[PDB]
Ligand binder design. Structure first.
Ligand SMILES: CC(=O)N[C@@H]1[C@@H](O[C@@H]2O[C@@H](C)[C@@H](O)[C@@H](O)[C@@H]2O)[C@H](O[C@@H]2O[C@H](CO)[C@H](O)[C@H](O[C@]3(C(=O)O)C[C@H](O)[C@@H](NC(C)=O)[C@H]([C@H](O)[C@H](O)CO)O3)[C@H]2O)[C@@H](CO)O[C@@H]1O
Ligand SMILES: [K+]
Ligand SMILES: [K+]
Ligand SMILES: [K+]
Length: 192
């Protein structure tokens, strides 16, 4: 079975995305404007990111961009995904963590995939982790070819804190601007 709800998740997580690195964003109201090679990207702040981003100019940011509709209307602007850029613009990973994907393949059978997952950003948004991990799962683990049910991604930190992305719904918009230290990620576990 493939419900419309599942189909809508496939649609969302197949949206075009891009990223911008080490540039200024100018905040007016709750919208941050980025200009990169004369192209404008407006980003909506609607969570804790409202306390993080200053009114006016903010230097040396990165942004993970997922457009919310097509095209030019303001309600289609990307939401959250702003972080401070790395201390340097070096290309090396800043952390590497185990990614464990466990999938029920039958009544009595489970498949377990264990790989290294590279972290490049010192400060990373839940938006980016959510979108990119789902991309991995869609590509490699057939996510959304079946009903996701209670499947989830959990990102666990070195202090034992964790962050969960329930796969049967989009990441909540108010969580998209939440950020974490990528170097404090301990492991990532996915149950399918
Ligand atoms: C009606 C509605 O949309 N309500 C949401 C909350 O979501 C509902 O309740 C949840 C408990 C869950 O049953 C969900 O399905 C309901 O729609 C939402 O609560 C968050 O939900 C997510 C899952 O979607 C997580 O369970 C999250 O908990 C954790 C997490 O695991 O990610 C707990 C964890 O301890 C905490 N980490 C800390 C404190 O270090 C994290 C962390 O705060 C966040 O991940 C940061 O974004 O959260 C539930 O908190 C709620 C909060 O987003 O908003 C509405 O009330
Ligand atoms: K359809
Ligand atoms: K590690
Ligand atoms: K099983």
């Amino acid at each position: 079975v493939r419900s419309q709800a599942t189909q809508d998740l496939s649609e969302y997580y197949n949206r075009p995305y891009f990223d911008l690195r080490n540039l200024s964003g100018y905040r007016e109201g709750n919208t941050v404007t980025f200009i990169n090679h004369y192209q404008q990207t407006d980003v909506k702040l609607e969570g804790k990111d409202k306390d993080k981003i200053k009114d006016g100019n903010n230097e040396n940011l990165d942004v993970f961009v997922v457009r919310e509709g097509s095209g030019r209307q303001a309600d289609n602007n990307s939401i959250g995904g702003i972080t401070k850029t790395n201390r340097t613009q070096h290309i090396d990973t800043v952390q590497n963590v185990n990614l464990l994907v466990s999938k029920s393949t039958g009544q009595h059978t489970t498949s377990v995939t264990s790989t290294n997952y590279s972290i490049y950003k010192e400060e990373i948004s839940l938006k980016e982790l959510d979108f990119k991990l789902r991309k991995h799962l869609i590509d490699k683990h057939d996510l959304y070819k079946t009903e996701p049910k209670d499947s989830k991604i959990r990102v666990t930190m070195k202090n034992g804190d964790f962050y969960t992305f329930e796969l049967n719904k989009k990441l909540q918009t108010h969580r998209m601007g939440d950020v974490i230290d990528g170097r404090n990620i301990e492991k990532i576990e996915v149950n399918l």
